[PDB]
Design a protein around this nucleic acid. Sequence first.
RNA 1: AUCGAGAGGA
Lengths: 309, 62, 117, 151, 46, 67
Amino acid sequence: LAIKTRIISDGLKYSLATGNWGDQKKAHQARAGVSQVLNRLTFASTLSHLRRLNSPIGRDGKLAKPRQLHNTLWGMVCPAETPEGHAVGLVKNLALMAYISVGSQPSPILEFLEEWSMENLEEISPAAIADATKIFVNGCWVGIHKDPEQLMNTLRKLRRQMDIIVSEVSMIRDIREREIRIYTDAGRICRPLLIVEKQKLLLKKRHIDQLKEREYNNYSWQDLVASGVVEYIDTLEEETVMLAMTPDDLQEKEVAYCSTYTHCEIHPSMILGVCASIIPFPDHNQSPRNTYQSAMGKQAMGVYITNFH
Amino acid sequence: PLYVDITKTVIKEGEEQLQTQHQKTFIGKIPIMLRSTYCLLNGLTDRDLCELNECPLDPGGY
Amino acid sequence: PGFVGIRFCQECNNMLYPKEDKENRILLYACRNCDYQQEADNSCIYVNKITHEVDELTQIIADVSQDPTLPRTEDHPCQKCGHKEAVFFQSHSARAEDAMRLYYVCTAPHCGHRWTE
Amino acid sequence: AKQDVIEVIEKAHNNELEPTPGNTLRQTFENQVNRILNDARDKTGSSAQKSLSEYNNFKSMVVSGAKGSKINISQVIAVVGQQNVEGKRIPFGFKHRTLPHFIKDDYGPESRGFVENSYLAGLTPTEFFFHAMGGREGLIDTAVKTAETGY
Amino acid sequence: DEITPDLWQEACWIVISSYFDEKGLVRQQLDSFDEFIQMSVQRIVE
Amino acid sequence: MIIPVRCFTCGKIVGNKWEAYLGLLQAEYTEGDALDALGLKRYCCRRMLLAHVDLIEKLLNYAPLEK
RNA sequence: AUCGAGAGGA
Ligand SMILES: [Zn+2]
Ligand SMILES: [Zn+2]
Ligand SMILES: [Zn+2]
């Protein structure tokens, strides 16, 4: 009698039904736009709705900075799919291959750092920080290190064989400032990028052959990630990543542009979304036309579902 | 329906303690997103999905 | 002219503040917490460099050569060790947004020479 | 034009670029880079217009004034042109990089958003992203100015 | 041993097909709700 | 959902060629070879067959409401 | 029918 399931059931139902994310009494204080009715006009509309993002900046805001397509949105957010009206530049759609981290516990990473030459902040001499490197795990400074290069190599090696460090874990080394950042929390956007050797792709004909018969030897994308040829790179890790657009950019040329590539894109077309991949030859169109089609495909009429009867 | 195990121990005086574990106490019904690991459509083949009048191509997530 | 750094007390490990004994007029640095005091030698209390005429080589660190992002060249050899490879970039800092002068860092390990043509 | 821009970049890196009066060195550097690129775009558009024949429907609808323009013909045939955000080139969204596919401190036309190809040829993916930025800026201006104009 | 340019156009799309056959398209929502209903509720209760 | 009876542009019958087209496809024929075999000379009818998806088969998986 | 919210079109 003391307990009441009514609060839990009714509150969850009310939030999911109205969209006001908060208490029922604070209806005006609650934020709207969450829990919208699923668009079932067409399958593309349904998928785009299921892969939709938004930013709580507000439609009344006249500042153009939040709505501007940032350079950072590459491979994470479709550069064409956005509402034409007031929500332009605020409501966004996920890129096709974009995956966002579900979160993990950084305890194994902290234990491994303790096992390594990482020195605890309470034990370090105060004068050992100027020339050493600082290590941050999930935002909290946990210690200093004296071989950041070797530590980063070892951490990447662990991440590439499904060891204590999982694939989704971010690992950014900024060099100008000696900080080393390791991220594990949820909400981090990332995409799979092919790892590149000295100058060569790590993916090989053996991997492609085993993927060809994907229905026989159960060699799947999980095995691809485990073998260490594809890595999930988040946004902050992309700053230190040198990306080859295609393997054609690794071939030696008469003039050397980069010659130190560390990653390669699987395919450039993955930057598009769901309603933008329907466009044939989008590189021969003007961008507002691509955006108009991305908005207009959700209005296209077809078989929205097989069990419409 | 979500059930929670509750352990109530009465402490009054003179080491008069006794723990009564109210196993599987109902706390509320949590809405389940379709195609999740706790939906009845998880892992079901397309034939079974069609048997239950559900579209195999339906992605869920709602 | 040069710059002036702060001084610490040998008793409480607090900063020494400028002070002066009128009897001898000798630049003293007296800690204002305790009675400890010291005799200065720089004879300078405060400088304010507006032209910020400082060398960016001091701020440049030698561990940046291990960045797989910055460009590399073989046409500017290191003067200290003769190594052909070098990594170059701009000042990329405030009060140095202009002056696109290239700052070169030797790639070879244990040298880390930073210079500018 | 690419060779000329490389020459400006080398001159800037060798401290051989004396700033024009009333402008900063990066200001002078950019202004002349954009001048070179704009001259190249105008010249290639003029070449496309000359190449156009009397039976061309683009030219027909342009000379009639019904639709299109010289800039539309030029972007369709010769060169789309420089993509500009807030009146300047594509900003360094990353750490001194417009996209992670370039090197740090690269003020070349391709890095800063000079779409080298035409619409008929098709844009490379970096150019596609930069053109998407430009179109987004146009949409932002269109969707923002209306309330102030109505007031 | 190495992917030749005339085979890369097929190899890359085989890789992408493997990705979309394993992961899906609603994987972010599926995994987020699984995370919630698996550890987040227990974390709250404890 | 189902194969249209006629080509939209010219009105030639294409509703009796879907099963034969599928049989030719299973008989290792190229799509264009099958279209030529079925006498689809015009590219309108070639489109009408080549771009057709057959959702009636998927709809037939669900059980009928009335037995 | 009222309020509020969301999605949209020009
Ligand atoms: Zn003192
Ligand atoms: Zn050297
Ligand atoms: Zn026909």
